[PDB]
Amino acid sequence: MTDKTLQQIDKLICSWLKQIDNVIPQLIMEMTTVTNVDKQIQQQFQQFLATYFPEHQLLAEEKSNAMITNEINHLWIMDPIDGTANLVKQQEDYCIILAYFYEGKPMLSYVYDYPHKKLYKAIRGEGAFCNGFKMEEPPSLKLEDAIISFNAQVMNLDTVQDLFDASFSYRLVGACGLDSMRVAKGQFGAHINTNPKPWDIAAQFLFAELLNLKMTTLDGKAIDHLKGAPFIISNKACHETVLKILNANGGYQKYR
Amino acid sequence: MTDKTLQQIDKLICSWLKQIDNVIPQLIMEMTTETKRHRFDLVTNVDKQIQQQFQQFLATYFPEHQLLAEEKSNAMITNEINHLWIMDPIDGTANLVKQQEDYCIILAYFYEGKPMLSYVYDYPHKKLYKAIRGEGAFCNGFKMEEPPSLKLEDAIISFNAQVMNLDTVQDLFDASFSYRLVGACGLDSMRVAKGQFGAHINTNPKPWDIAAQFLFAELLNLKMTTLDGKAIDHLKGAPFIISNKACHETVLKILNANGGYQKYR
Numbered sequence A: 001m002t003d004k005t006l007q008q009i010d011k012l013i014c015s016w017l018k019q020i021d022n023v024i025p026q027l028i029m030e031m032t033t034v035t036n037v038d039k040q041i042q043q044q045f046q047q048f049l050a051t052y053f054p055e056h057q058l059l060a061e062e063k064s065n066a067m068i069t070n071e072i073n074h075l076w077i078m079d080p081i082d083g084t085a086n087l088v089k090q091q092e093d094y095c096i097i098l099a100y101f102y103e104g105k106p107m108l109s110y111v112y113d114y115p116h117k118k119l120y121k122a123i124r125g126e127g128a129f130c131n132g133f134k135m136e137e138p139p140s141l142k143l144e145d146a147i148i149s150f151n152a153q154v155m156n157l158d159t160v161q162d163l164f165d166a167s168f169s170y171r172l173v174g175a176c177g178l179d180s181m182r183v184a185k186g187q188f189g190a191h192i193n194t195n196p197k198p199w200d201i202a203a204q205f206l207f208a209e210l211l212n213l214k215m216t217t218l219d220g221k222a223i224d225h226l227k228g229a230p231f232i233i234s235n236k237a238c239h240e241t242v243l244k245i246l247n248a249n250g251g252y253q254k255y256r
Numbered sequence B: 001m002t003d004k005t006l007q008q009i010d011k012l013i014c015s016w017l018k019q020i021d022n023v024i025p026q027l028i029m030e031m032t033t034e035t036k037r038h039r040f041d042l043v044t045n046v047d048k049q050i051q052q053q054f055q056q057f058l059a060t061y062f063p064e065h066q067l068l069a070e071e072k073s074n075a076m077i078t079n080e081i082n083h084l085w086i087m088d089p090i091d092g093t094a095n096l097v098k099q100q101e102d103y104c105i106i107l108a109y110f111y112e113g114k115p116m117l118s119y120v121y122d123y124p125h126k127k128l129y130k131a132i133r134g135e136g137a138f139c140n141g142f143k144m145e146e147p148p149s150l151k152l153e154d155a156i157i158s159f160n161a162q163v164m165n166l167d168t169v170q171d172l173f174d175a176s177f178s179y180r181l182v183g184a185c186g187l188d189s190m191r192v193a194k195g196q197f198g199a200h201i202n203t204n205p206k207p208w209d210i211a212a213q214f215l216f217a218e219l220l221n222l223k224m225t226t227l228d229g230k231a232i233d234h235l236k237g238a239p240f241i242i243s244n245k246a247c248h249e250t251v252l253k254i255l256n257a258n259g260g261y262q263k264y265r
């Protein structure tokens, strides 16, 4: 793929996301008085592909994905609303996740923090950006100096306590895409999700590559972008320590 | 106090908070340029400066008005003080230092002990939550209303899990819809005020962490009490909850069951 083609696609995605701005307030007003919001955003993206990129296929949360394989050369993975609980309960702290893979290789990635008007995007060969401003590799963060984010309700409490004690503090935004972007920005040392779907993490691959983040399974391997696996996205300086804590003493799972 | 006087004071405070753009952005810049070792010290220094400047603001506009804040001695501040401001110039210090986000300014005026004006300035998002007795509560001039009823099972809750025993934390997890944490008392409180969270707990706040919230709770029909359901002394602070009216009792029940929420030993 060329830089010229990537920019053309990028230009069309940024325009689509701007059109989304024109539709979403109405969908939100209807929801208020899974949602229609998730399903409509997804359907509109499907129409966008049908119109602009007829060869491209979609793996997304609100459709069946049985026909999506590693043979598909032009693939988008979408979470149309990541943070559905935050959308419904708070109307805040949710995002749109989009990622394009070409012959299996991450080429374009998007995390749109709509409520706060911040577009994180990554373009292979160009870099990562927040609202157009180039992002750089975050400063090194040792676990003891870093805030971490994970779901404490899906782990055994002894392991949750070990994570509390070894880190600087604990926070949770509650949307995978956003908690990940805080790692990307150097605000959090690490974000963990012990059982993500492909759409929860699809954009993050390219961000992790371009910003020198560690993004691995909880066993330290590369993740299958078609399947998802227990995962971490981490600053390079606290990745090993976090994995070590999670896997010590018989591991992080609930004994329950 | 008249609506005319409150507005005059309100207008002054809003203007002063706007002028805070001359201080805060510089501290934020320095969270990048100064070494890790000095960062909390820089924040506490700028906390002290913002506080002193508010002190001077009072001396010049409101000569009898006094100030209760962290960076000054408050030994002489009593229930005898007729005109009292309580201030947290930067609430959410750890978020400022580590994230340069999710921090706020807390300011509250009490007249003869009664909450009259309150401010939570979400500075990174430029969102001024303010409350005025007789007028109501506002976010950037959009008028806030009492939130919908939220039973605990349907609500997101926010608290510091590291300061409670884990059995009680588990009971809070199981009984609520979900768990979130912003990490600044003022902001986690405003999410309760907006109906985004069912409840926020802080088991050991200072007066300045919670001073604004009294008036917001009154005007928006929120329950704001000690963890044993009493009125909180605004001069002293206590273990506290701010909650939607429909999940207040259930949360307190969970916290106080089984010997309470404290850590063991």
Ligand SMILES: NC(=O)c1ccc[n+]([C@@H]2O[C@H](COP(=O)([O-])OP(=O)(O)OC[C@H]3O[C@@H](n4cnc5c(N)ncnc54)[C@H](OP(=O)(O)O)[C@@H]3O)[C@@H](O)[C@H]2O)c1
Pocket: A079, A081, A082, A083, A084, A085, A150, A151, A153, A154, A174, A175, A176, A177, A192, A193, A194, A195, A196, A197, A200, B177, B178, B179
């Ligand atoms: N394994 C984990 O680390 C984890 C993380 C979150 C949630 N959950 C599970 O989700 C159920 C209810 O929601 P919650 O409050 O825990 O999460 P949530 O707060 O509703 O969502 C938190 C984040 O995790 C995603 N998510 C939703 N369901 C998930 C699942 N089953 N496994 C992993 N991630 C998921 C969300 O994606 P969408 O908003 O697009 O759904 C969002 O990005 C729970 O019973 C819990 O087991 C597990």
Ligand SMILES: NC(=O)c1ccc[n+]([C@@H]2O[C@H](COP(=O)([O-])OP(=O)(O)OC[C@H]3O[C@@H](n4cnc5c(N)ncnc54)[C@H](OP(=O)(O)O)[C@@H]3O)[C@@H](O)[C@H]2O)c1
Pocket: A168, A169, A170, B088, B090, B091, B092, B093, B094, B095, B159, B160, B162, B163, B183, B184, B185, B186, B201, B202, B203, B204, B205, B206, B209
């Ligand atoms: N529920 C609680 O008792 C509670 C709540 C928060 C923090 N803490 C403890 O205090 C320390 C600071 O927390 P952090 O590193 O997450 O971030 P933080 O920015 O220091 O504290 C988070 C929030 O609680 C306030 N705070 C600071 N020290 C506190 C204390 N001892 N008790 C209650 N509230 C406090 C903060 O106000 P300022 O930014 O003005 O300090 C902010 O509103 C840790 O040891 C933490 O576990 C306890």
Ligand SMILES: [Ca+2]
Pocket: A038, A061, A079, A080, A081, A082, A083, A084
């Ligand atoms: Ca979703």
Ligand SMILES: [Ca+2]
Pocket: A079, A081, A082, A083, A176, A199, A200
């Ligand atoms: Ca998701």
Ligand SMILES: [Ca+2]
Pocket: B088, B090, B091, B092, B185, B208, B209
């Ligand atoms: Ca505070």
Ligand SMILES: [Ca+2]
Pocket: B047, B070, B088, B089, B090, B091, B092, B093
């Ligand atoms: Ca403070």
Ligand SMILES: [Cl-]
Pocket: B182, B187, B188, B191
């Ligand atoms: Cl907030």
